[PDB]
């Protein structure tokens, strides 16, 4: 089946809560796979200790960039960029997860989950799983964003992994 996996978030130190993921395995195997094992940490980097550096209120919260935590870092677990796999999953509203990207085919680490429908970026960025469980957790992250995107509090996933 799916992985379901989950990133635990603070914010300055303080414990937001859980939130759970599916990734559509069946969708797009090798985006999927890459989240999947970025969560583990099973090849010796990740998301653990990192942050959600770009929070927009109205719109995502973007995290993944576990080198350089501003947004212009990150690799994947295949090499420092993959390509676009598909377009088959759209982004239909809240809780949409999908990737950031820099233009086709510079998937990395860098990712997002959308606080609204996002429709606008179908086509454009690789949609590969949604939010199961903690869209509470999500719109708390997205209380510390701002319409420029930085973050007024430190928000860190102080640990991550896979439940099934
Ligand atoms: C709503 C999300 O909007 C975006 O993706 C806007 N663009 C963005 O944040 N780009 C950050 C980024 C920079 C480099 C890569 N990758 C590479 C070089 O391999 C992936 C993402
Ligand atoms: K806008
Ligand atoms: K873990």
């Given amino acids: 089946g799916n992985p379901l996996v989950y990133l635990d978030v603070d914010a300055n130190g303080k414990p937001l809560g ?9 969708v797009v195997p090798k985006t999927a796979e890459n989240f999947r094992a970025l969560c583990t940490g099973e090849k010796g980097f990740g998301y653990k200790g990192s942050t959600f550096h770009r929070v927009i209120p109205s719109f995502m919260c973007q995290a993944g960039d576990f080198t350089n935590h501003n947004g212009t870092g990150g690799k994947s677990i295949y090499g420092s960029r993959f390509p676009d796999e598909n377009f088959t999953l759209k982004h239909v ?8 990207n820099a233009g086709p085919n510079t998937n990395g680490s860098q990712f ?7 429709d606008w970026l179908d086509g454009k960025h ?7 469980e903690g869209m509470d957790v999500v719109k708390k992250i997205e209380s510390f964003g701002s319409k420029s995107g930085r973050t007024s509090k430190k928000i860190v996933i102080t640990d991550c992994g896979q439940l099934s």
Wanted: a positive charge; proline letters at 3%; glycine letters at 10%.
């Fill in 18 to 26: 859980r939130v759970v993921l599916e990734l559509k395995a069946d």
């Fill in 93 to 100: 509203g809240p809780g949409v997860l999908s990737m950031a």
């Fill in 112 to 118: 997002f989950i959308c606080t609204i429908k996002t």
């Fill in 126 to 132: 690789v949609v590969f799983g949604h939010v199961i």
